[PDB]
C-alpha cells in the first residue's frame, strides 16, 4: 500500500525493521543474553514416562517477522529465537503443573494436590518449620526429595542455624536446604514467603511430541489483522512466520506427596 508510516498490526506482534517513528534499524548489533536461559523444573524433578500417543495437551505459538527485518536488521533471528521459545514452553508447563496458573488444562496440579490434602504449614521460615514441613511428608511414609522456592527468599534462609550443632542449616553455596536440593522458580506467582516440597518421584510427566518447528512464507495468519482489519497474508505482505508446537502430559500418582509452607 501507499502508507509511508509502517504497517500497524493488531496485535502489534510482528517484528519490524522500521519503528513507528520511521527509524530504521540498519547496522543493528545482535542482542546479548543478559540472563541465563531457564529450564523446566517439573521435567527436572519429576519422573519421565515413556508414552506413545496420548492425557496430553498441545502447546504452541507462532512468531511473524517482516522480511525486511529478516534481511537487514537481523538475519539469524529464527535460529537464535528457538531456545527462547522452548524456554517459554517450559515456563508454561511448569506454571501449570506446579502453580495451577496459566489455564492449565490437565485438571491436575501440585497446588490442587496440596489444596486437597490441606498439607500446609502457616509460619515464618525457622528450623522447626522446615522440620515440620518435612514431617508432613514423612507422616505418610514419604520422604522429601527436593524444595521449590522463590529465589528472593535466600535472605530468609541464611538466617536459620541449627541451635544444637550451631551452624547454618542452609548451604548458600550448594543452594541446598537440609541437604535437599532447592530449585528456584523465576515465575511471579510464587510469593516471597512461600516454599514447596514433595517426593517428586510421585509426579509423572510425558512428552508425546518434542517441539516441531516449521518456518513458512505463504500461510495466512487469521489472528493478525492489518490496520484495515484484513488478515495478514505472508506471501503478499512480504513476510515470514515461525510455528512451534509441542504435546505434554501430566499425571500425579499420589497427591499426598506434596506439602507447602506459607506466611502466616
Amino acid at each position: 500500500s501507499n502508507n509511508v508510516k509502517p504497517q500497524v498490526f493488531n496485535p502489534d506482534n510482528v517484528m519490524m525493521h522500521e519503528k513507528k517513528d520511521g527509524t530504521l534499524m540498519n547496522e543493528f548489533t545482535t542482542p546479548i543474553l543478559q540472563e541465563v536461559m531457564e529450564n523446566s523444573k517439573i521435567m527436572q524433578l519429576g519422573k519421565y514416562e515413556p508414552m506413545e500417543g496420548t492425557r496430553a495437551f498441545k502447546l504452541g505459538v507462532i512468531l511473524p517477522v517482516t522480511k525486511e527485518f529478516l534481511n537487514y536488521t537481523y538475519s539469524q533471528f529464527f535460529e537464535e529465537m528457538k531456545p527462547m521459545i522452548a524456554e517459554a514452553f517450559y515456563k508454561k508447563f511448569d506454571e501449570a503443573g506446579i502453580l495451577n496458573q496459566g489455564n492449565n488444562p490437565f485438571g491436575k496440579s501440585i497446588a490442587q494436590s496440596i489444596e486437597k490434602t490441606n498439607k500446609v504449614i502457616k509460619g515464618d521460615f525457622t528450623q522447626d518449620n522446615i522440620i515440620d514441613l518435612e514431617a508432613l511428608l514423612e507422616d505418610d511414609e514419604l520422604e522429601a526429595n527436593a524444595f521449590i522456592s522463590k529465589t528472593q527468599n535466600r535472605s530468609l534462609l541464611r538466617k536459620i542455624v541449627d541451635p544444637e550443632t550451631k551452624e547454618r542449616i542452609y548451604d548458600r553455596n550448594s543452594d541446598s536446604l537440609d541437604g535437599l536440593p532447592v530449585v528456584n522458580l523465576k515465575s511471579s506467582n510464587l510469593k516471597r514467603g512461600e516454599l514447596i516440597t514433595g517426593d517428586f518421584d510421585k509426579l509423572i510427566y510425558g512428552i508425546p511430541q518434542l517441539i516441531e518447528y516449521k518456518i513458512d512464507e505463504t500461510a495466512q495468519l487469521s489472528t493478525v489483522k492489518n490496520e484495515d482489519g484484513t488478515p495478514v497474508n505472508l506471501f503478499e505482505q512480504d513476510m515470514v512466520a515461525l510455528r512451534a508446537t509441542m504435546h505434554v502430559a501430566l499425571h500425579i500418582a499420589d497427591d499426598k506427596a506434596f506439602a507447602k509452607l506459607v506466611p502466616a
Binding site: L210, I211, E212, Y213, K214
Partner: protein, 51 residues
Amino acid sequence: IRNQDDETRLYKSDAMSTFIIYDNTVERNSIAGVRYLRTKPIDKTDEDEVF
C-alpha cells in the same frame, strides 16, 4: 578405527561435520576431536534438530 571384524580401517570424515580442539601450548597437540551429524529421515522434513 579398529573394526568389529578386527581390522584396522581408515575412513574419511566430512569437513562440514568434524573438528579438532588443540592443546593451548605452542606444540598444539590435538586434545579431542568431535563429529556431529544430523540424523534425518526422508519422508518428512523432520522438524526437530537432533544431532
